[PDB]
């Protein structure tokens, strides 16, 4: 289904912003 | 259902967004 | 339509994700 | 190095996301 | 065909975020 | 390998622009 793809790719792309900010904080603190 | 996967990017793309701001904040400082 | 809109929005989202990793990576530049 | 390789691989599937999301625009329309 | 094709991609990218998370994951440990 | 990753990165956010531009113009 495309309606589950594009939950799946929000979801996806949740994780790697939070993933991201962790590092930025990381690096910064 | 449909409507469960448009609540559900709804969700993830508010956090996504928060996410962002707080990259942003850590990549000035 | 909802199936439109909801795959634009994620578009644009995934774009503002690239610019930050982008920005993230700078660190390690020489 | 670790965090350099992440964010290639994640920039990549990223390109690929967007790529598939343009076929499935397109294929709706 | 084209939207197939489109899932298959989407399928193969998430499995490459999942595992770039993993490597940030171990990083930041 | 940085400055690899650095250009691979560049360049996936050029690939990425594009195809916004192919969903922005199929929505129409």
């Not at 289904?1 to 603190?29: D, M, N, V």
């Amino acid at each position: 289904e495309i309606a589950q793809a594009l939950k799946e790719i929000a979801k996806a792309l949740k994780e790697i912003a939070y993933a991201l900010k962790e590092i930025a904080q990381a690096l910064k603190g």
